Design a protein around this ligand. Sequence first.
Ligand SMILES: CCCCCCCCCCCCC/C=C/[C@H](O)[C@H](N)CO
Ligand SMILES: CCCCCCCCCCCCC/C=C/[C@H](O)[C@H](N)CO
Lengths: 245, 245, 193, 297, 297, 49
Amino acid sequence: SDRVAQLTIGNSTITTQEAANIIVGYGEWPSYCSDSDATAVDKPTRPDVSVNRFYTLDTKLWEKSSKGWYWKFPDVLTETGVFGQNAQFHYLYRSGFCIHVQCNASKFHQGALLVAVLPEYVIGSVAGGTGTEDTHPPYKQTQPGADGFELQHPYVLDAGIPISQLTVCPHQWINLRTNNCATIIVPYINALPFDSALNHCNFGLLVVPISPLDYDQGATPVIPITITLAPMCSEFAGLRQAVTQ
Amino acid sequence: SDRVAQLTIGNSTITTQEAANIIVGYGEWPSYCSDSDATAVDKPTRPDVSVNRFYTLDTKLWEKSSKGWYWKFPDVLTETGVFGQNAQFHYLYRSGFCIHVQCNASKFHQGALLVAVLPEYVIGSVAGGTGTEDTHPPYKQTQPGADGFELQHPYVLDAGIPISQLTVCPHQWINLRTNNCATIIVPYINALPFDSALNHCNFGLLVVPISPLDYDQGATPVIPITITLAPMCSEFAGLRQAVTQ
Amino acid sequence: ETILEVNNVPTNATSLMERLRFPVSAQAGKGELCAVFRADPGRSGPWQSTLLGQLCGYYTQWSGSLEVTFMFTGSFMATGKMLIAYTPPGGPLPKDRATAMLGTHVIWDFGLQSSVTLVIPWISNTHYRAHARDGVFDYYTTGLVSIWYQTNYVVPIGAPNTAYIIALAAAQKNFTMKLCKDASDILQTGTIQ
Amino acid sequence: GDRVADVIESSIGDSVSRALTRALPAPTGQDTQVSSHRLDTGKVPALQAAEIGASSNASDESMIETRCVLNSHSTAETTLDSFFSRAGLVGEIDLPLEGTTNPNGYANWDIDITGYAQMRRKVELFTYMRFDAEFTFVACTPTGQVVPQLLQYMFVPPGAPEPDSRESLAWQTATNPSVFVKLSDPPAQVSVPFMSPASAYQWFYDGYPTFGEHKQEKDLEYGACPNNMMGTFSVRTVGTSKSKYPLVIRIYMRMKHVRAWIPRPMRNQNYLFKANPNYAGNFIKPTGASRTAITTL
Amino acid sequence: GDRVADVIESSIGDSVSRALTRALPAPTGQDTQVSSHRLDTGKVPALQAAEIGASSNASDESMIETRCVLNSHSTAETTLDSFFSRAGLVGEIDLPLEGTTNPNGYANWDIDITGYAQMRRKVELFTYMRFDAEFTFVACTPTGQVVPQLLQYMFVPPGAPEPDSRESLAWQTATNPSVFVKLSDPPAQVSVPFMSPASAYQWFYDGYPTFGEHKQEKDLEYGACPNNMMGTFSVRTVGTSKSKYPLVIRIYMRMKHVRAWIPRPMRNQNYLFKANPNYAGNFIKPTGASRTAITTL
Amino acid sequence: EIGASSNASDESMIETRCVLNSHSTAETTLDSFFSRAGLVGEIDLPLEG
Ligand SMILES: CCCCCCCCCCCCC/C=C/[C@H](O)[C@H](N)CO
Ligand SMILES: CCCCCCCCCCCCC/C=C/[C@H](O)[C@H](N)CO
């Protein structure tokens, strides 16, 4: 079939019964770095099963007036489990990801979500309203952490770029009439074979409700949204002591 | 030659010029667990280069009236680096070790050290002096940590067992006239393929001065003793959240 | 498979029958906790109601992986997701869902298939586990199972707000027992006559 | 030595990238085939599912009755070279006789192509680019006349000493490349290679260059990519005394040998700052035009 | 799939144990070969180096002039079976008519062989052992006479209900093994297998059985190995009323099919407690005897 | 609902290693379980009663 799926990796498993296939980012699977492309000389580590597993980060509430949220990678995991420990202890980093978004409702609820992956998603500021002020986004806005951050101008995605063209990026829709989950597989996206896991963020994940949630009075009003994700083919290098940030 | 040596593993290297060969514990090299001997079903992790490296724990002062010290394994490393992180996050553990002891002096200093490895080194108490009291060693004595602990009755090794027979265990001498270092390689010693790294201690390391330090007034009086060690062929299993102790 | 008594709170005769299932209902969407139980089949607790547990009460040492199957008995119009975690031995009870995900877990989605299987793998340091009990013999503990809300229990207008879940337990094909002994409980007070 | 089954059969180390898609030649547009009516159940190409994230693949032949057209329309003009290998203005340097901007007869211009909207919008359609360049220097007075003046251009790579005055010793150019040209001559034109320490220039960089506390003073580091800092371009009038004519210099850039990766949405707001995607918050305008009602034109 | 060189050539997974030493048969003692004088430089077997940790390997033939002896002395008596397959006392159970120890005519004896020094010193030369057992029950009155009394022995594995009285229902022994024997009969003798959850019994265990805070009350857990807890041995006099004779029971254990690992130094102090290596701190005595001076006998 | 035990195994749910299980099943047979003696009746023969 196609509507039913089960994803198993490491010591975790995700089952679903309202799937909509699986999107592979740019038609490419995650992979390790080859010997002709690597530039550092020390032997990298590949912890395998202890880091390649599904992590559930947090839950958000979908309301009739919600605007949207974004998460930054791998900032969400820089402080979770063995993956977070390895990312703190090492200088270099390289991995892909497997994202699963959970959101379920009844057959009498309606609404649509756009789930997209935008690499190098630099967040711009409002520049003081008039535009004569040279401002930069603060820490809680550029690197919100594992708790996410809410969009202020979802029509421009806080960067002056229209949301109507966000579908050129790897994406899936969560339409409550049809499905209740989304899966996007992202390979490693960078111009360098290895990069820092703490200073640099590779991509950002966007969840914006295009069609407002609506239901009749009496039905369940609490509709949560959940994010689950698993690193794939992780490598680390340049071992030293741990650094907090 | 034989008096000169260099030990390299991971991203660390130890050189010496006054070696006395290398002792292999019970004539066996450390190794991984085979498929006919393993009992747990999940796939264990083998982090390789990030944990198999030389760790320098601390330095002790050798005086004319010192009695001795002991260290417990892997309690010394349960809280150091990536190895400590993996030992905290996982339930099971399996590895060998490579111990190097540094102690150097001049050609006008004298003295001898006995460096030995005693598995399952249970520490007994003095039982209240008279022996009618049922006491047990406290935490700082049974599990001293990475700082070690000093012997109170080195003639009995705090267990009622004579030190004259400690040479039946894998051992080396540090005689200042001849050498200034010792190396013992220990395979995995246990009756179980895997065991806890926090509750159970596999062996203990003993350093007792049999010949007292002596020198003439004017020579350097501060003679330190240093312990360096590297896990070998490490495995971990049973991943959950981290536990402090 | 036989029914497992996760809800072994009630004791009076007028309410003995709801020990066979436990409820789910709409929550505030914050990853709330539903139930916990241990994984020892021959120990006092929920497992005493199973044939596997009763038979393992006759043997001191066991070895193998177990399985638990949960059946949802809500209305056809009710949806939801749950997180079911197994915590390997040595760790305390998880305080929240974020800590509980770090163990072995499965995400359960309600659909046309009512049931899911949670497999409790054989993770131990010894080849066999002796029967532990209260005191210092708990060094052969097995671990914990806890069930957390993933999204919510959402129901439309006109369908009940509370639904019950039935759990079924068994052993796998590598399960084995050893060292036959007498059972702990004796079902006789005087002379049977 | 590998002896355990989970290491023998392991898939760790696969460095090759599994590609689900392959490139096929397409010199012209695709032809149209003959089609006829169809009246059957179970086979419906009109109905799709946009939730999956894939573009709908119904064609002409499956929806309406069509004729055969031999399409011979070339696709050669939409290539990356054809789109990008056109010169455009990227910087201006002003050398007035009196003023406060460049009062000494020399100027330093940091090389960046995000200073002008026409070029910036075109180049920011993508995330990474790797290309060669062709720079042209057109010099004239504010009234536009050409005068007999001798100028010197110098390329200063990062780490080299920047000139501080018109009589600085850096103008000996023992190692730096330089161009001596007169205004009466045709514009100067030089070719520049790909100079990045990385494999591509990235116009967006979600990160900071250094560790530490990210306070107010250490906040401009966001989006600052050190790998796009390609040095300085220095100009001066050759002579020990002050010049006679005020001069304006315009720089034009033309790309070639281009490769691009990771397309992104085009900008729809007015630009405010360089290397900074900020937008006027209180003056947000729609992407397109508007109309009175949805049912009328 | 392995594609990178450091994974292809990796040595991870080698499960086989590299052995530097091998076992060679030795039914008798080693012979002595003929030797003669040697007067040369550079070849000295007398001088050694004890720092390395290896026993000196100079032999008779290299130090003194020796004859040829055909040694035929057997080494059969020092094997593990020959050393350990001898019975010895390990426990006593007292069943007095009146008293406070066992006043009800029944007793429970937890099975452990560290209660008596003769056996304990022999068994604690090693760290791990795996063997079979043979138990013998010799019963007599305090004056040593044999009387017509019927007894029941029961083996209670861990987890089984321990009897609480002489009329307890556990004595139905539907599953537990039991022995009914009379004092006029020869002693009872049964064979017991290897019962550990692990591959060997360990007499020393440097650890605690559970996690948590290690306070004063939770301190006896040190050295307590759950894998050596093999259950209880229960005895009683068969009858509904009180017995007529006070009885004493002595248990003798004989090992067989033995394997041992990791030798350790022998104990040289007096024992104080069971499963506890504590020693009298204020009364430490030397291992051996002493003499007045080092130069005299 | 069908009445059949669930047949998901270890290899289908989590990532597992290869274990060569050699644990015997000989002790759970009917003879091994039942061929043990136990008390079934008592007969009392008092002098007076
Ligand atoms: C005597 C020769 C003088 C002419 C000097 C021209 C050299 C130009 C330097 C290389 C320009 C590279 C093109 C742009 C690269 C970076 O991406 C931009 N700075 C973006 O900010
Ligand atoms: C009807 C039969 C009654 C006789 C019962 C004798 C059974 C003896 C049980 C097994 C004994 C194992 C030998 C010792 C094992 C442990 O290492 C010791 N307890 C050490 O403390």
